[PDB]
Each structure stands twice: as structure tokens, then as C-alpha cells.
Curated annotation (Swiss-Prot):
Domain notes: EF-1 binds magnesium constitutively under physiological conditions, EF-3 and EF-4 bind calcium cooperatively and EF-2 binds neither calcium nor magnesium.
Superkingdom field: Eukaryota
All copies of domain EF-hand, residue ranges: 4-39, 41-72
Localization in the cell: Cytoplasm, Cytoskeleton; Cytoplasm, Perinuclear region; Cell membrane; Golgi apparatus
Phosphoserine found at: 25
Entry comment on modification after translation: Phosphorylated. The phosphorylation regulates the activity.
Protein name as catalogued: Calcium-binding protein 1
Species per Swiss-Prot/TrEMBL record: Homo sapiens
Subunit structure: Homodimer; when bound to calcium or magnesium. Interacts (via C-terminus) with ITPR1, ITPR2 and ITPR3. This binding is calcium dependent and the interaction correlates with calcium concentration. An additional calcium-independent interaction with the N-terminus of ITPR1 results in a decreased InsP(3) binding to the receptor. Interacts with CACNA1A (via C-terminal CDB motif) in the pre- and postsynaptic membranes. Interacts with CACNA1C (via C-terminal C and IQ motifs).
Entry function: Modulates calcium-dependent activity of inositol 1,4,5-triphosphate receptors (ITPRs). Inhibits agonist-induced intracellular calcium signaling. Enhances inactivation and does not support calcium-dependent facilitation of voltage-dependent P/Q-type calcium channels. Causes calcium-dependent facilitation and inhibits inactivation of L-type calcium channels by binding to the same sites as calmodulin in the C-terminal domain of CACNA1C, but has an opposite effect on channel function. Suppresses the calcium-dependent inactivation of CACNA1D. Inhibits TRPC5 channels.
Positions with a binding annotation for Ca(2+) 2: 17, 19, 21, 23, 28, 55, 59, 62
Tissue expression per record: Retina and brain. Somatodendritic compartment of neurons. Calbrain was found exclusively in brain where it is abundant in the hippocampus, habenular area in the epithalamus and in the cerebellum.
Residues annotated for Ca(2+) 3 binding in this entry: 54, 56, 58, 60, 65
């Protein structure tokens, strides 16, 4: 019931979850940011990003919190 638009986001969201839970957790996040950034330190910043995103109460990013974090 939806054409191109938010699906692309799913593409990323897919590569995000290396396993299969449709949920990017600090562990999965770091792995994600690592593939793009890599090297360097600062882990608190990672969780900080997942903490200020929105977390309706799961302290984690989901296709929803992920869609709002990607947009500008
Ligand atoms: Ca959330």
C-alpha cells in the first residue's frame, strides 16, 4: 500500500540489521557507524545518538526512529 519513498530507507535498515530483528541496537548501530566511519574512538556518542533520537521507550532505533534520523 505504499510506493517508492520510505522503502529505500528499508534498504538501509536492512543492511543495518546484519542478523534479522528489524531493530538497530547500540551493538548493531556501532557496527553500522563502523562500516561508514571506522577507526577513531568515542562510543558514548553512539549511544547518545540512539538516546536523543526518540526511543518511544525501547532506548533503541527502529524503522520508525530510523526514518526520522535519516531525513534532514
Ligand atoms: Ca525509538
Amino acid at each position: 500500500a505504499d510506493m517508492i519513498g520510505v522503502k529505500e530507507l528499508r534498504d538501509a535498515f536492512r543492511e543495518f540489521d546484519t542478523n534479522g530483528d528489524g531493530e538497530i541496537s547500540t551493538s548493531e548501530l556501532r557496527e553500522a557507524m563502523r562500516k561508514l566511519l571506522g577507526h577513531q574512538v568515542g562510543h558514548r556518542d553512539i549511544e547518545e545518538i540512539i538516546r536523543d533520537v526518540d526511543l518511544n521507550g525501547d532506548g533503541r532505533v527502529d524503522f520508525e526512529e530510523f526514518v526520522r534520523m535519516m531525513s534532514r
